[model samples]
Target: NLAPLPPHVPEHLVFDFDMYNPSNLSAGVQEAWAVLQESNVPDLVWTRCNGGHWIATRGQLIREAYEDYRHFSSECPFIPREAGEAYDFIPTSMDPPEQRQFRALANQVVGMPVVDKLENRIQELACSLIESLRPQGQCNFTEDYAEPFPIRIFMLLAGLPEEDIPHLKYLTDQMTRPDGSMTFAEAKEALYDYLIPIIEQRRQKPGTDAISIVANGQVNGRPITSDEAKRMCGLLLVGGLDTVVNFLSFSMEFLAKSPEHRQELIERPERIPAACEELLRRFSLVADGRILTSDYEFHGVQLKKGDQILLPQMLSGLDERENACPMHVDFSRQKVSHTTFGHGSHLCLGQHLARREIIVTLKEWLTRIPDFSIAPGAQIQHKSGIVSGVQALPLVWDPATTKAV
Candidate 1:
């Protein structure tokens, strides 16, 4: 049936999941999605939850939505209209042609060459942090390693102070997974407050930091406006701050529980890159959705013009249709395609930094503590939202395998 949505769906399928919190997010988002998948939900479904939107389950559909920006606009790119209002960052908010201009500015700092420029610092931070904690035998993986590892490297790349991270990181977290202290709008403002002065500072005197690159960048043969510069820089901060931050915890949790998977990385260190790709595929991190521009029938359902849809990039490749045994991690898979980092014009620009961080951590951490698992009896939980991640990762490892510093 060429339908906008499945016909048998009850009138209540439109009820927002948020009203009841039907998800077991405390067990972590992956488990919560497992709840839905186990129920045999199709690749495309709708929920009125978080203000009603479509959830694209398969990679093909998700990619199509992301790539076909004309139909699926990124302008108001959040479930709750209030949340979408907060998303004013460049490229992400701007659709095509115009979006391309800002993308070039973003590409300069996070591009392959620039990441290569920052590679040594990234490696040093990973090894040094891991080496310092090797003797402890136990560590709070979220705070100690996962969080700071990427944030610090991002700060270095942007030429921002490490101290600024605590403030900005907190605000970014609120924007994604609100904890009541700040609403989505307030969090957006707080981040903007921080960026305003920095953007101004860079506008007057440009430097090599990513912020400067965007602030002083050219768009369509003309320099980027200050407004465009601020928004673009803000996206980079969130991209570097939250995406990798949560991703590390999610991946590390899997590594801790699945020793077999960990061993694969250890034995075939060359597989680090492919392993990162698979992990991103299996543990896709983004849970954002696009707003509908107009009334339309999609996959059988009649979607109202203003109805919101939660297109979880995290859940896309998970269905076996897009990938064989989608959940399993395989380094030698013939082809592993996913929207873990995202898809299309809105795809992540800081992916080089993300990939490098994951690859480096695997190489360094595994060499020291290749075998580890969640701490006994500790209930590690995950927070879900635009970015989903672990609340705490209590990781314990054998000290005997440690290399003497």
Candidate 2:
């Protein structure tokens, strides 16, 4: 049930779109959200779907809110009020001045250096996994490769066991696109409980692993507290486990249906990076929000203190003003403008890692299984939330066309 409209909100401005579960999901999650871009939908409107909150529809409004962090605080970034209250991840949950130090420390764990080190191992796994599946006439893309490839690499970097991924992924998922199964508070605490001892152990005997690095790192000259270490580690785990894993599915789904797009990349391998950027723009799928710090007038709307405004990073590149024929994927586009990684100070820290994964996947997968499509009579499905994902992708291919390296 939708919440009662707040008296402070204008009735004409009400647009009850639920971020977690949009009405037009069958059309695809990104398409479901583009409904907001329609001419009639104001630049910023209040949606009562998720316990009543403001939604910035256009990329222009999204960039403004993200840049003005003082008015749009990160302290409570999630929705349903309770979840936002419980979302205290490091760097992202902290805003400006104070947020800077944590971001630097967090960067040390996931920054460019991390990707540079994992390059060989990443390529090896992508090839190794694809080679094994190449002989099979058909496979479930999401489980067969999507989940294992990046996840295994992340687990190795963080010194986490492969066995723990199932538990960790479930809890991480609850924070972004919570099913009725668990509240964000319960999910966050469950993650914290798992991290507490690991942080304590890693602090005493620090190693080169991402978890150990964050656990023992200093913040603002003082050694990070146990609570601080746990929060930052939780943030790293979520990004590692979810973001790119879901993204690869979207990119593959597109290529499966568009043979020419796949063939273009196979011919001009140099264009993989450009195609990767275009794919990132076309399949962008992260949407989180900021909460209002105090009463303020934004683009003619009066936002009260404690109000929440969702600024979807996904919509930025999709906006016609930011990109023409925004839905079309053109590797030769002059400017691939987007906030897929995010905007302003809170930009995604693991973007380098994500880019490397996407580039490697496209190059390696296409070189091996160049021709594949949705399994016969199988209908693909998508689910939406802070981080959207393809529920399943059944793919079929001719085993004879595959390559062995």
Candidate 3:
């Protein structure tokens, strides 16, 4: 059941930031969460945004919430209570003991082994994409490189056809930013409607695809049910669609503006991997939080029972107390501690794949394009929501270095 809004919040000024912002967003893109971080005190506060909730500002509270899933149930874990309640994916939305079972199965598909298996493919695809655009001198980076690279890889992993991507990607976007065209329930039903049949077909004769493996595999010592498979597959679809796409766009935008940073990578290719890790920390962008399971005083504030608390996955590393000048991207930070990929047991299961994609792209792009920037005098726009990202990145580089064949 959804909790009542904490009494302290004001009725107006809700934190429902518009994901699709039409403004000077090159700077705005990076500063969205920094604006939130400016809020004062107690390490946590309750705000009535998307139907009201509490937010954890510091890393300690955020880490604690992720670690103790029992206290902070992942079920109904999103803001705007409807999305949370409607969320029924296997591991992300379930508490441990029960959640841990399917988590292992999920790990097999999008985890380290799978990431290692796909590393070479990722490098090739990134290079191919960058090479195709670099000679052009300018291109809309989002459509040109960001979207296709990750989504196609996701499709390959899921044993899904590239043709089906447009449909699923659209539905997943709705769940995050939600253009308000469809109610949460309606959009969710639309997703399951698509997944149910796929799950059934895969179960009949499983293939080498990740989806087939999960659909046919057992969770908690029992064969996964069709309903369970649909929900789990739906989660994977959302994960595969949004996470990397967002990361790629944001990382590119950062590199475009920070020539010094890009130059560092160009000179030292080995540092690209660490640069990817540091970038993930510097720009940890995701906006889902946890709910307070009980009323209690935490960090000197009286948090009520059943109060919703938002620990935006984005803000964790930016805590200066934990990471000095957390905003500054230091590729050499001795101990890089941040919840960019999450912390504790809830640390993102798919992080390995994301890292591989990021690292490989940096290496290849530096080798080929090596240097690019947001197009001269052209504006960049950004969008936010559950996963904030750049809507478009107009990029340009000197074409003089390499001419036509």
Q: Give the candidate number with the greatest lDDT.
A: 2
**Where in model 3 is the C-alpha error above 4 Å?**
1-26, 39-42, 402-405
- Candidate 2 vs. truth: CA RMSD? 0.8
**What does the lDDT come to for candidate 1?**
0.78
**Best prediction by TM-score:** 2
lDDT of 3 at 389: 74
Q: lDDT by residue for model 2 over 211-329, one digit each (tens)?
A: 99888888889888988888888888889999998999999999999999999999999999899999898899999899888999999999999999899999998899889999898
Q: What are the per-residue Cα lDDT tens digits for candidate 3 across 1-405?
A: 223545655434234333334133456654755655564444565554455677777778888877877567777778777778877877777776777788888888888888888887887788778778777888887888888999999988888889987888888888876777887778889989988888888899889999898889888778988888887888888889988888888888888889899889888877877788788888787867666677666666666666667777777788777789888888988877778877766678988888888887777776677667888787776676777777788988887753332
lDDT of 3 at 65: 75
RMSD of each: 3.6, 0.8, 3.2
**lDDT by candidate, in order shown:** 0.78, 0.91, 0.76
Better of 1 and 3 by TM-score: 1
Provide the TM-score for each candidate, comma-separated: 0.92, 0.99, 0.92
Clashing pairs in 2: none
